[model samples]
Target: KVFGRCELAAAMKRHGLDNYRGYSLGNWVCAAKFESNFNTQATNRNTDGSTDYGILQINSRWWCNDGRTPGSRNLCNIPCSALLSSDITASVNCAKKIVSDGNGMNAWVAWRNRCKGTDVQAWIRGCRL
Candidate 1:
Protein backbone atom coordinates (compact mmCIF):
# COMPACT_ATOMS: atom_id res chain seq x y z
CA LYS A 1 0.00 0.00 0.00
CA VAL A 2 1.40 3.35 -0.99
CA PHE A 3 0.33 6.00 1.48
CA GLY A 4 -0.27 9.69 1.04
CA ARG A 5 1.81 12.13 3.05
CA CYS A 6 -0.69 12.87 5.77
CA GLU A 7 -1.92 9.29 5.72
CA LEU A 8 1.52 7.96 6.49
CA ALA A 9 2.26 10.67 9.02
CA ALA A 10 -0.91 9.97 10.96
CA ALA A 11 -0.38 6.24 10.77
CA MET A 12 3.21 6.59 11.94
CA LYS A 13 2.16 8.76 14.83
CA ARG A 14 -0.48 6.22 15.78
CA HIS A 15 2.21 3.59 15.89
CA GLY A 16 4.33 5.63 18.32
CA LEU A 17 6.92 6.91 15.86
CA ASP A 18 6.36 10.50 16.93
CA ASN A 19 9.36 11.85 18.89
CA TYR A 20 10.99 8.46 18.87
CA ARG A 21 14.59 8.77 20.02
CA GLY A 22 14.52 12.56 19.65
CA TYR A 23 13.66 12.39 15.98
CA SER A 24 10.45 14.18 15.22
CA LEU A 25 7.47 12.60 13.51
CA GLY A 26 8.35 14.66 10.45
CA ASN A 27 11.86 13.29 10.44
CA TRP A 28 10.56 9.76 10.41
CA VAL A 29 7.96 10.63 7.81
CA CYS A 30 10.55 12.31 5.64
CA ALA A 31 12.87 9.36 5.78
CA ALA A 32 10.00 7.08 4.83
CA LYS A 33 9.16 9.34 1.91
CA PHE A 34 12.62 9.09 0.43
CA GLU A 35 13.30 5.53 1.43
CA SER A 36 10.13 3.94 0.01
CA ASN A 37 7.80 6.68 -1.13
CA PHE A 38 5.40 5.31 1.48
CA ASN A 39 5.11 2.05 -0.36
CA THR A 40 4.76 -0.70 2.21
CA GLN A 41 6.17 -3.49 0.08
CA ALA A 42 9.14 -1.66 -1.41
CA THR A 43 12.36 -3.61 -1.72
CA ASN A 44 15.85 -2.70 -2.83
CA ARG A 45 18.81 -4.93 -3.47
CA ASN A 46 22.12 -3.48 -2.45
CA THR A 47 25.39 -3.93 -4.30
CA ASP A 48 26.80 -5.70 -1.26
CA GLY A 49 24.17 -8.44 -1.81
CA SER A 50 22.07 -7.43 1.15
CA THR A 51 18.45 -6.49 0.69
CA ASP A 52 16.43 -3.64 2.12
CA TYR A 53 12.76 -4.31 2.86
CA GLY A 54 9.54 -2.51 3.73
CA ILE A 55 8.49 1.11 4.01
CA LEU A 56 11.48 2.03 6.16
CA GLN A 57 13.75 -0.17 4.07
CA ILE A 58 15.27 -2.12 6.94
CA ASN A 59 18.31 -3.96 5.69
CA SER A 60 18.91 -7.68 5.87
CA ARG A 61 22.52 -7.25 6.89
CA TRP A 62 21.97 -6.52 10.59
CA TRP A 63 18.27 -6.26 11.10
CA CYS A 64 16.05 -8.89 9.48
CA ASN A 65 17.48 -12.11 8.09
CA ASP A 66 16.80 -13.02 4.50
CA GLY A 67 19.00 -16.12 4.74
CA ARG A 68 21.01 -14.62 1.89
CA THR A 69 22.95 -11.86 3.54
CA PRO A 70 26.07 -13.57 4.80
CA GLY A 71 26.72 -13.22 8.51
CA SER A 72 23.44 -11.43 9.01
CA ARG A 73 23.03 -10.36 12.61
CA ASN A 74 19.20 -10.49 12.37
CA LEU A 75 19.07 -8.10 15.28
CA CYS A 76 15.36 -7.72 14.77
CA ASN A 77 15.07 -11.53 14.95
CA ILE A 78 12.45 -11.50 12.23
CA PRO A 79 12.14 -12.92 8.75
CA CYS A 80 12.77 -10.30 6.06
CA SER A 81 9.36 -11.13 4.68
CA ALA A 82 7.78 -9.88 7.88
CA LEU A 83 8.46 -6.30 6.84
CA LEU A 84 6.74 -6.45 3.49
CA SER A 85 3.21 -6.36 4.78
CA SER A 86 0.90 -3.37 4.75
CA ASP A 87 0.91 -3.35 8.53
CA ILE A 88 3.94 -1.35 9.68
CA THR A 89 3.98 -2.46 13.31
CA ALA A 90 6.85 -4.86 12.75
CA SER A 91 8.75 -2.29 10.75
CA VAL A 92 8.30 0.23 13.51
CA ASN A 93 9.65 -2.19 16.06
CA CYS A 94 12.70 -2.87 13.94
CA ALA A 95 13.25 0.84 13.50
CA LYS A 96 13.21 1.26 17.26
CA LYS A 97 15.97 -1.29 17.57
CA ILE A 98 17.92 0.57 14.88
CA VAL A 99 17.58 3.98 16.49
CA SER A 100 18.70 2.53 19.81
CA ASP A 101 21.94 1.52 18.16
CA GLY A 102 24.83 3.97 18.12
CA ASN A 103 24.08 4.95 14.54
CA GLY A 104 20.61 6.19 15.55
CA MET A 105 18.72 7.52 12.54
CA ASN A 106 21.92 7.60 10.55
CA ALA A 107 21.52 3.88 9.94
CA TRP A 108 19.71 4.77 6.71
CA VAL A 109 21.91 6.51 4.18
CA ALA A 110 18.79 7.81 2.41
CA TRP A 111 17.69 9.43 5.63
CA ARG A 112 21.11 10.99 6.06
CA ASN A 113 21.33 12.24 2.50
CA ARG A 114 17.75 13.39 2.08
CA CYS A 115 16.04 13.90 5.41
CA LYS A 116 18.92 14.68 7.74
CA GLY A 117 19.87 18.24 8.72
CA THR A 118 17.06 19.61 6.58
CA ASP A 119 13.85 21.32 7.57
CA VAL A 120 12.19 17.99 8.23
CA GLN A 121 9.36 19.78 9.95
CA ALA A 122 8.09 20.80 6.57
CA TRP A 123 7.41 17.19 5.78
CA ILE A 124 4.55 17.17 8.23
CA ARG A 125 3.17 20.65 7.77
CA GLY A 126 -0.64 20.87 7.97
CA CYS A 127 -0.87 17.12 8.45
CA ARG A 128 -3.36 17.53 11.28
CA LEU A 129 -1.35 15.48 13.68
Candidate 2:
Protein backbone atom coordinates (compact mmCIF):
# COMPACT_ATOMS: atom_id res chain seq x y z
CA LYS A 1 0.00 0.00 0.00
CA VAL A 2 2.95 2.24 -0.39
CA PHE A 3 2.10 4.70 -3.16
CA GLY A 4 4.75 5.92 -5.54
CA ARG A 5 4.72 8.88 -7.85
CA CYS A 6 2.40 7.36 -10.45
CA GLU A 7 -0.08 6.04 -7.91
CA LEU A 8 -0.06 9.34 -6.13
CA ALA A 9 -0.65 11.12 -9.41
CA ALA A 10 -3.65 8.97 -10.17
CA ALA A 11 -4.92 9.55 -6.67
CA MET A 12 -4.53 13.25 -7.07
CA LYS A 13 -6.23 13.20 -10.45
CA ARG A 14 -9.13 11.17 -9.13
CA HIS A 15 -9.75 13.14 -5.96
CA GLY A 16 -8.55 16.51 -7.13
CA LEU A 17 -10.71 16.86 -10.26
CA ASP A 18 -12.09 20.38 -10.38
CA ASN A 19 -11.17 20.62 -6.75
CA TYR A 20 -7.51 21.01 -7.67
CA ARG A 21 -6.95 24.69 -8.07
CA GLY A 22 -3.25 24.77 -8.97
CA TYR A 23 -0.46 23.59 -6.70
CA SER A 24 -2.95 21.46 -4.86
CA LEU A 25 -1.42 18.27 -6.19
CA GLY A 26 2.06 19.25 -5.15
CA ASN A 27 0.81 20.32 -1.77
CA TRP A 28 -1.06 17.06 -1.26
CA VAL A 29 1.92 15.01 -2.32
CA CYS A 30 4.15 16.99 -0.04
CA ALA A 31 1.87 16.46 2.88
CA ALA A 32 1.45 12.76 2.17
CA LYS A 33 5.18 12.37 1.79
CA PHE A 34 5.78 13.99 5.14
CA GLU A 35 2.88 12.41 7.01
CA SER A 36 3.23 8.78 5.95
CA ASN A 37 5.69 8.59 3.07
CA PHE A 38 2.68 7.89 0.86
CA ASN A 39 2.13 4.58 2.60
CA THR A 40 -1.56 3.83 2.77
CA GLN A 41 -1.00 1.16 5.38
CA ALA A 42 0.92 3.53 7.62
CA THR A 43 -0.08 3.57 11.27
CA ASN A 44 0.90 5.52 14.34
CA ARG A 45 0.74 4.70 18.04
CA ASN A 46 0.15 6.98 20.97
CA THR A 47 2.28 6.77 24.09
CA ASP A 48 -0.42 4.53 25.55
CA GLY A 49 -0.40 2.41 22.35
CA SER A 50 -4.19 2.45 22.33
CA THR A 51 -4.67 3.91 18.83
CA ASP A 52 -3.63 2.63 15.44
CA TYR A 53 -4.93 3.00 11.89
CA GLY A 54 -4.27 3.23 8.13
CA ILE A 55 -3.34 6.01 5.71
CA LEU A 56 -4.29 9.50 6.65
CA GLN A 57 -3.50 7.89 9.93
CA ILE A 58 -6.86 8.40 11.57
CA ASN A 59 -7.25 7.39 15.19
CA SER A 60 -9.82 4.62 15.37
CA ARG A 61 -11.09 5.19 18.87
CA TRP A 62 -12.07 8.80 18.36
CA TRP A 63 -13.46 8.41 14.85
CA CYS A 64 -14.77 4.86 14.67
CA ASN A 65 -16.89 3.21 17.36
CA ASP A 66 -20.40 1.99 18.09
CA GLY A 67 -23.39 4.29 18.68
CA ARG A 68 -22.46 6.61 15.80
CA THR A 69 -24.78 7.43 12.90
CA PRO A 70 -23.97 6.41 9.32
CA GLY A 71 -23.46 9.99 8.16
CA SER A 72 -21.34 10.58 11.20
CA ARG A 73 -19.37 7.57 10.13
CA ASN A 74 -18.69 9.23 6.79
CA LEU A 75 -17.75 12.45 8.47
CA CYS A 76 -15.47 11.13 11.21
CA ASN A 77 -16.00 7.48 12.03
CA ILE A 78 -14.66 6.08 8.75
CA PRO A 79 -11.91 3.55 9.42
CA CYS A 80 -8.47 4.39 8.06
CA SER A 81 -8.31 0.90 6.58
CA ALA A 82 -11.46 1.62 4.64
CA LEU A 83 -10.10 4.92 3.50
CA LEU A 84 -6.95 3.30 2.13
CA SER A 85 -8.85 0.42 0.54
CA SER A 86 -11.21 2.80 -1.23
CA ASP A 87 -8.45 4.68 -3.12
CA ILE A 88 -7.46 8.30 -2.94
CA THR A 89 -10.70 9.59 -4.37
CA ALA A 90 -12.66 8.26 -1.46
CA SER A 91 -9.92 9.11 0.98
CA VAL A 92 -9.64 12.70 -0.18
CA ASN A 93 -13.39 13.13 -0.28
CA CYS A 94 -13.66 11.80 3.23
CA ALA A 95 -10.88 14.11 4.36
CA LYS A 96 -12.51 17.02 2.60
CA LYS A 97 -15.62 16.43 4.61
CA ILE A 98 -13.96 15.81 7.91
CA VAL A 99 -11.37 18.55 7.59
CA SER A 100 -13.09 21.31 5.71
CA ASP A 101 -16.36 20.22 4.10
CA GLY A 102 -17.23 22.77 1.39
CA ASN A 103 -14.01 24.63 1.98
CA GLY A 104 -11.62 21.79 1.42
CA MET A 105 -9.69 23.79 -1.13
CA ASN A 106 -9.14 26.43 1.46
CA ALA A 107 -7.89 23.77 3.78
CA TRP A 108 -5.30 22.85 1.18
CA VAL A 109 -4.38 26.48 0.91
CA ALA A 110 -3.89 26.68 4.62
CA TRP A 111 -1.91 23.48 4.62
CA ARG A 112 0.43 24.91 1.99
CA ASN A 113 0.78 28.05 3.99
CA ARG A 114 2.29 26.10 6.83
CA CYS A 115 4.12 23.36 4.97
CA LYS A 116 5.20 25.08 1.77
CA GLY A 117 5.80 28.43 3.41
CA THR A 118 4.30 30.35 0.54
CA ASP A 119 1.20 32.19 -0.42
CA VAL A 120 -1.59 30.34 -2.20
CA GLN A 121 -0.88 32.15 -5.46
CA ALA A 122 2.81 31.30 -5.35
CA TRP A 123 2.06 27.70 -4.46
CA ILE A 124 -0.05 27.39 -7.58
CA ARG A 125 3.00 28.25 -9.66
CA GLY A 126 4.83 25.21 -8.34
CA CYS A 127 2.28 22.75 -9.65
CA ARG A 128 2.67 21.19 -13.08
CA LEU A 129 -0.71 19.48 -13.18
Candidate 3:
Protein backbone atom coordinates (compact mmCIF):
# COMPACT_ATOMS: atom_id res chain seq x y z
CA LYS A 1 0.00 0.00 0.00
CA VAL A 2 2.99 2.32 -0.11
CA PHE A 3 3.01 3.49 -3.74
CA GLY A 4 1.88 2.97 -7.27
CA ARG A 5 4.38 2.53 -10.13
CA CYS A 6 5.07 6.17 -10.88
CA GLU A 7 5.11 7.06 -7.21
CA LEU A 8 7.55 4.27 -6.58
CA ALA A 9 9.78 5.57 -9.37
CA ALA A 10 9.90 9.03 -7.85
CA ALA A 11 10.79 7.56 -4.51
CA MET A 12 13.54 5.48 -6.06
CA LYS A 13 15.03 8.45 -7.84
CA ARG A 14 14.77 10.50 -4.67
CA HIS A 15 16.68 7.79 -2.84
CA GLY A 16 19.35 7.76 -5.56
CA LEU A 17 18.30 4.32 -6.56
CA ASP A 18 17.79 5.50 -10.16
CA ASN A 19 21.36 4.54 -11.06
CA TYR A 20 22.90 3.02 -8.01
CA ARG A 21 25.77 0.68 -8.74
CA GLY A 22 25.43 1.22 -12.51
CA TYR A 23 22.02 -0.36 -12.74
CA SER A 24 19.16 1.61 -14.30
CA LEU A 25 16.08 2.92 -12.49
CA GLY A 26 13.97 0.46 -14.45
CA ASN A 27 15.71 -2.36 -12.68
CA TRP A 28 14.49 -1.13 -9.34
CA VAL A 29 10.94 -0.63 -10.48
CA CYS A 30 10.76 -3.91 -12.34
CA ALA A 31 12.27 -5.81 -9.47
CA ALA A 32 10.00 -4.11 -6.98
CA LYS A 33 6.92 -5.13 -8.91
CA PHE A 34 7.96 -8.72 -8.92
CA GLU A 35 9.42 -8.70 -5.45
CA SER A 36 6.71 -6.95 -3.46
CA ASN A 37 4.69 -4.61 -5.68
CA PHE A 38 5.95 -1.57 -3.76
CA ASN A 39 4.60 -2.83 -0.48
CA THR A 40 7.18 -2.52 2.25
CA GLN A 41 5.30 -4.79 4.60
CA ALA A 42 5.64 -7.59 2.11
CA THR A 43 7.32 -10.70 3.45
CA ASN A 44 7.61 -14.24 2.25
CA ARG A 45 8.91 -17.49 3.69
CA ASN A 46 11.86 -19.05 1.98
CA THR A 47 12.58 -22.71 1.44
CA ASP A 48 15.69 -22.88 3.60
CA GLY A 49 13.97 -21.65 6.73
CA SER A 50 14.91 -18.13 5.75
CA THR A 51 12.57 -15.33 4.80
CA ASP A 52 12.43 -12.53 2.25
CA TYR A 53 11.46 -9.22 3.73
CA GLY A 54 10.29 -5.78 2.58
CA ILE A 55 9.86 -4.33 -0.92
CA LEU A 56 12.96 -6.03 -2.23
CA GLN A 57 12.23 -9.24 -0.41
CA ILE A 58 15.62 -9.23 1.23
CA ASN A 59 16.49 -12.68 2.43
CA SER A 60 17.41 -13.64 5.98
CA ARG A 61 20.15 -15.87 4.60
CA TRP A 62 22.64 -13.01 4.65
CA TRP A 63 20.93 -9.66 4.93
CA CYS A 64 18.89 -8.97 8.06
CA ASN A 65 18.42 -10.66 11.39
CA ASP A 66 14.99 -12.21 11.66
CA GLY A 67 15.92 -13.74 15.05
CA ARG A 68 14.04 -16.90 14.25
CA THR A 69 16.78 -18.39 12.15
CA PRO A 70 19.50 -19.89 14.30
CA GLY A 71 22.38 -18.49 12.27
CA SER A 72 21.50 -15.59 10.03
CA ARG A 73 24.30 -13.64 8.46
CA ASN A 74 22.48 -10.45 9.45
CA LEU A 75 24.96 -8.36 7.54
CA CYS A 76 22.67 -5.35 7.57
CA ASN A 77 22.44 -5.49 11.39
CA ILE A 78 18.73 -4.81 11.19
CA PRO A 79 15.73 -6.79 12.31
CA CYS A 80 13.68 -8.14 9.43
CA SER A 81 10.57 -6.77 11.09
CA ALA A 82 11.91 -3.25 10.78
CA LEU A 83 11.83 -3.56 7.03
CA LEU A 84 8.10 -4.23 7.02
CA SER A 85 6.80 -0.69 6.84
CA SER A 86 5.93 2.19 4.56
CA ASP A 87 8.75 4.27 6.00
CA ILE A 88 11.21 2.59 3.56
CA THR A 89 14.18 4.50 4.87
CA ALA A 90 16.01 1.55 6.33
CA SER A 91 14.82 -0.77 3.62
CA VAL A 92 16.04 1.51 0.85
CA ASN A 93 19.37 2.04 2.56
CA CYS A 94 19.81 -1.68 2.95
CA ALA A 95 18.72 -2.33 -0.60
CA LYS A 96 21.36 0.00 -1.98
CA LYS A 97 24.00 -1.81 0.00
CA ILE A 98 22.91 -5.09 -1.47
CA VAL A 99 23.22 -3.83 -5.04
CA SER A 100 26.60 -2.30 -4.31
CA ASP A 101 28.00 -5.71 -3.47
CA GLY A 102 29.24 -6.39 -7.03
CA ASN A 103 26.23 -8.45 -8.04
CA GLY A 104 24.20 -5.37 -8.91
CA MET A 105 20.56 -6.32 -9.39
CA ASN A 106 21.70 -9.92 -9.32
CA ALA A 107 21.02 -9.82 -5.59
CA TRP A 108 17.35 -10.21 -6.45
CA VAL A 109 16.31 -13.37 -8.26
CA ALA A 110 13.18 -11.66 -9.47
CA TRP A 111 15.33 -9.31 -11.48
CA ARG A 112 16.97 -12.17 -13.27
CA ASN A 113 13.73 -14.01 -13.91
CA ARG A 114 11.48 -11.15 -14.87
CA CYS A 115 13.26 -7.88 -15.53
CA LYS A 116 16.41 -9.02 -17.22
CA GLY A 117 16.59 -6.90 -20.37
CA THR A 118 12.91 -6.18 -20.07
CA ASP A 119 11.66 -2.81 -21.25
CA VAL A 120 10.51 -1.12 -18.04
CA GLN A 121 10.21 2.41 -19.42
CA ALA A 122 6.56 2.49 -18.41
CA TRP A 123 7.51 2.28 -14.78
CA ILE A 124 8.65 5.87 -15.05
CA ARG A 125 6.61 6.91 -18.04
CA GLY A 126 4.61 9.69 -16.42
CA CYS A 127 6.68 10.36 -13.32
CA ARG A 128 7.84 13.97 -13.13
CA LEU A 129 11.14 12.93 -11.63
lDDT of the candidates, in the order given: 0.91, 0.51, 0.82
lDDT, candidate 2, equals 0.51
For model 1, residues 1-129, the per-residue Cα lDDT tens digits are: 998888889988998989988989999889899999999999999889899999999999999999999879999989999999898888989998898776678898789999989999898899987
TM-score of each: 0.95, 0.58, 0.92
Best by TM-score: 1
| CA deviation > 4 Å runs, candidate 1 | none
Q: Could you tell which candidate, 1 or 2, scores higher by lDDT?
A: 1
lDDT tens per residue, model 3, 17-104: 8777777788888898999988888989977789999888998878889877757888777988878878777778888878666557
Q: How close is candidate 1 to the true structure, as a TM-score?
A: 0.95
Which candidate has the highest lDDT of all?
A: 1
Give candidate 1's error at residue 102 in angstroms: 2.4
If candidate 3 were superposed on the true structure by all CA atoms, what would the RMSD be? 1.3
Q: Give the Å shift of residue 46 in candidate 3.
A: 1.8
State residue 94's C-alpha deviation in candidate 3, in Å.
1.0
Q: Runs in model 2 with CA error above 4 Å? A: 17-23, 48-52, 61-74, 101-114, 118-129
Worst 10 residues of 1 by lDDT: 100-109
Clashes of 1: 0
